[PDB]
């Protein structure tokens, strides 16, 4: 009469986030003909533009991971 | 009569994030024509302007990672 | 009669944050032609421009890792 | 009667390649969760065994162009 | 009677290859978790044995052309 | 009766590569969790055996071409 007690948990598990731009192919891109002619233009107020850029833009807060284990053996 | 406790968890585990701009080809990326041709132009107010830039911008608040263990083994 | 405990938890794991911009392949970026002419432009107030520019930007805020572990063994 | 042999091979090939390029190549092989239960393991002759191992090759030439040729001439 | 033998093989051959660039290349295997269990391990002729090892090859040429080529003229 | 063998291989062959840039190369490999239990291992010939080891190769030439030309001639 004798007790064996193996606690003997394996964990190869994985807990990943993958978040943004990831993994893309951008081929050539761009590569046309952009023409701009403009002339007399008036403006009052605040202006932005873009002609012919190319802008990639990436934001990202999240992808945040948490694991937690509890790994409690009790023997009285 | 005798008590063998055995305590091997093995953790092979990963915890991993991979946030923003990851593992990206960009191939000959422009590579066009811009012609801006631009006269009597007038701006009472701000202005920002792209011609023929290539932006690539990443902000990354995230991706943080949390791993807690608890490894408790008790006798009495 | 007697009392064995052999304590021996493995940690092989990993704790791993990629944060904005890695890994990515940028081959002959820009390679196009620009042609900005500008004649009689006037500017009241601010102005900010990017002719033919290439602008790679990168904020991380983030990627942070944090790991907790405890391990107890008591005996009575 | 007289032989006479002529062996008068003639080569210009050509075996080429151009690439733009190579990207990003990613090889991770996981192991998983082995196990072997046994009284004896007995291997008497010319045995391979491989029990959880991994062998893993990452070969990436940039041409790796292969041109193979074998002559061969007999007289008897 | 004579016997003429005339071997002449002509090789002008190219192999060749242009690459604009070799990238990011990760190799990472990772061992599993590899348990045996026996009384006997008995190995006796010419035996390989492997057990939770890694064998690793990175090989990355910037050509890694070959030419390979063989004459062989026998004469009786 | 009179024997003339001629061998007169000729080779211009070029072998070649033009790389313009060998990148990031990462050869991390990991071990895994290895347990080998026995009374007895017993290895009497020839016998090769890796436990829980890491054979690891990492090579990058800038060229690495190769040109192999194995010449025979036999006469009896």
Chains 1, 2, 3, 4, 5, 6 share one sequence.
Request: proline content about 4%; some cysteine.
């Amino acid at each position: 009469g004798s007790v064996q007690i193996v606690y003997k948990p394996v964990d190869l598990s994985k807990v990943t986030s993958k978040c943004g731009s990831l993994g893309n192919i951008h081929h050539k891109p761009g590569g046309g003909q952009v023409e701009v002619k403009s002339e007399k233009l008036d403006f009052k107020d605040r202006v932005q533009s873009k002609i012919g850029s190319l802008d990639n833009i990436t934001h990202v807060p999240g992808g945040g991971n948490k694991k937690i284990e509890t790994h409690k053996l009790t023997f009285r």
